[PDB]
Design a protein around this ligand. Structure first.
Ligand SMILES: *C(=O)c1cnc2ccccc2n1
Ligand SMILES: *C(=O)c1cnc2ccccc2n1
Length: 8
DNA sequence: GACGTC
DNA sequence: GACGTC
């Protein structure tokens, strides 16, 4: 759920 | 070494 | 249970 390297 | 929701 | 880039 967080976006810092993938964003899901 | 750093972040959590569809 | 899914997703890695600075
Ligand atoms: C987002 O909340 C989140 C949390 N845990 C994860 C584990 C694996 C892939 C993606 C994820 N996303
Ligand atoms: C992104 O590629 C990525 C990879 N590992 C992580 C570990 C902990 C927090 C965030 C992260 N992001």
């Amino acid at each position: 759920x967080a976006x810092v390297x993938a964003x899901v």
